[PDB]
């Protein structure tokens, strides 16, 4: 808020949620993925309360932003975990699924492909941990136009640029890389929209048991 760039980075690194573990049909894979998402969601709320400036928003706003962003946030986390595993998605350390295991679930392989493509892009860019936590906080604060928030968002942009300057990038390279990173958020929004439709269709089929928390987070999107 009055934080220095390095303080913001330290704050965001310290706030990071834990990496959770998992415990195959359409039903079982969806069971593991949704079971995992549900447990991760509990940790996401605690993380969100530690994003500098977030708890200064009203409760209503806090709920709104989390309801809007949760699947984007799960997805950027996944893509980050998967970055050093070309062709695979590291849902958890004991659930590392390669591209073809996504065919077990109807409609899933196309989503796997988008996540894998994003992970490739991160790898091509050599995305850094400090950049990643800035991006994930931007997603939380941006995703739900549905002044204090804009100032926190500007602060995180300052923090990304600080990281790049510290890395030795020229001003031209800083601005180019900033744009490249933020354009990836458009792709992450697209994947969340698609993933939300998919989750909705699995609920409606009533194949897989979905947790009450997960049903409420899904419901917020209609």
């Amino acid at each position: 808020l009055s934080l220095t760039a390095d303080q913001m980075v330290s704050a965001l690194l310290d706030a990071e949620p834990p990496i959770l573990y998992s415990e195959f049909s359409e039903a079982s894979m969806m069971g593991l993925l949704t079971n995992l998402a549900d447990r991760e969601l509990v940790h996401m709320i605690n993380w969100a309360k530690r994003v500098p400036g977030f708890v200064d928003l009203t409760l209503h706003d806090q709920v709104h932003l989390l309801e809007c962003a949760w699947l984007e946030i799960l997805m950027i986390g996944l893509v980050w975990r998967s970055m050093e595993h070309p062709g695979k998605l590291l849902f958890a350390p004991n659930l590392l699924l390669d591209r073809n295991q996504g065919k077990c679930v109807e409609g899933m392989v196309e989503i796997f492909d988008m996540l894998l493509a994003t992970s490739s892009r991160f790898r091509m860019m050599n995305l850094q941990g400090e950049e990643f936590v800035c991006l994930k906080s931007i997603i939380l604060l941006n995703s739900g136009y549905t002044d204090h928030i804009h100032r926190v968002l500007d602060k995180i942009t300052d923090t990304l640029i600080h990281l790049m300057a510290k890395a030795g990038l020229t001003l031209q390279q800083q601005h180019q890389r900033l744009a490249q990173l933020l354009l990836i958020l458009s792709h992450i929004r697209h994947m969340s929209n698609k993933g939300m439709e998919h989750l909705y269709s699995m609920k409606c089929k009533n194949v897989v048991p979905l947790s009450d928390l997960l049903l409420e987070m899904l419901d917020a999107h209609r």
């Binding site: 709320i45 409760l59 806090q62 709920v63 409420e216 987070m217």
Partner: peptide, 8 residues
């Protein structure tokens, strides 16, 4: 509603 309280 869960979210409302959890955040509290």
């Amino acid at each position: 509603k869960x979210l409302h309280r959890x955040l509290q």
